[model samples]
Target: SGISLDNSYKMDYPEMGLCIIINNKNFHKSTGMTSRSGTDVDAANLRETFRNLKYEVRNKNDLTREEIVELMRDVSKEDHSKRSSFVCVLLSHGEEGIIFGTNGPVDLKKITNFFRGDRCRSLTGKPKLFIIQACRGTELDCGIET
Candidate 1:
């Protein structure tokens, strides 16, 4: 699915922030399998959009699970006492609730938990948005004839 940022909303809070992580390695490199689309164009576009919004964007491409975990930890440790909103985007190949790293898989919950309200007290009572783009299953849909 694609996301557009055209929607308007009444803000009940103050500051807003965004973080983005992109996995750009080809599928063949990770799983020895190739996808029809060889590059992560979606992730690239997302990075551009967030940057245009003047967000303090951090983009990580083709990272291992260990790297991702460490990055999250580092960011969560930052003082967000002034910001009132946050957004995180994870772009990669996935199965259900698991996202693929450069060498292996990482559970979605493990990543998201670092930013949860209870986990990150600094971001409490704020909007913590996470956008995940990946296939949830192995089933391929046969499209209708045009």
Candidate 2:
């Protein structure tokens, strides 16, 4: 035969691990932003939707900057040794270069850094997904070529 079909090299499906979603709805009045409506629906939708796909989903609503950071820190410190991957979703307002927390805005870059290879060894070679849903007209695909 000229060619033979083979599937022996294929790997089995990986285990579905953690899926944490941080849904920020009501902001502090001092932050000069209005509270959001329907974000609760947004959070609930993801919880059911993602869980249906076999991932363990955790919902966290209206987080302050420090709290958000601490959450990431704790997750990163976990033993990912027996899991597939990690995920953290942020539902927030948008600015020049940061995602807003109820208390204030945290450097999204800094939070991301916590999962970097040098910082979070647990997830170094694993998929660390972040689904950033912004209230200010942001979407999964927004940028375009000139």
Candidate 3:
């Protein structure tokens, strides 16, 4: 298990194109935490980080739970048959493995599992990376939920 397969796969074709989605949401209502607008600066900074990849970057902000989930699905299903991978960036407050939606909370797995090989054929073997800036509660000191 010490060996890493991070760079095991290699592509033999020129890039058909790039499709990028950048989603960032800050300033929650229900949580009453105003320590968010700070991310506005992050948004501008991350914009370039994604554009460097030369992909179509779609940005969404202040969304609800279903909106977050649905948009993610749409991004993955957009046109994976033409691109090499998928990317998403989310900013919000969180606890444990749950991310807070402006309307409420959504499980982290629900958002990430959409890119599984069987579910997302476009990204079956392609890389799927998510840059999430959410707070994770440190109750177990980095151990699994008991």
lDDT of 3 by residue, 17-80 (tens): 3433334455456667555766767777776676775655666677778888887777656657
Name the TM-score of candidate 2. 0.80
Sorted on lDDT, best first, the list reads 2, 1, 3
- lDDT, residue 92, model 3: 82
Off by over 4 Å in 3: 1-28, 138-146
Off by over 4 Å in 2: 1-14, 135-146
lDDT winner between candidates 2 and 3: 2
Please say which candidate is ahead in TM-score: 2 or 3: 2
In angstroms, the error of model 2 at 119 is: 1.7
For TM-score, the strongest prediction is 2
User: What TM-score, over all chains together, does every model reach?
Assistant: 0.76, 0.80, 0.76
Clashes of each: 0, 0, 0
Q: What's the CA RMSD of model 3 in angstroms?
A: 6.5
C-alpha lDDT score of every prediction, in listed order: 0.72, 0.80, 0.69
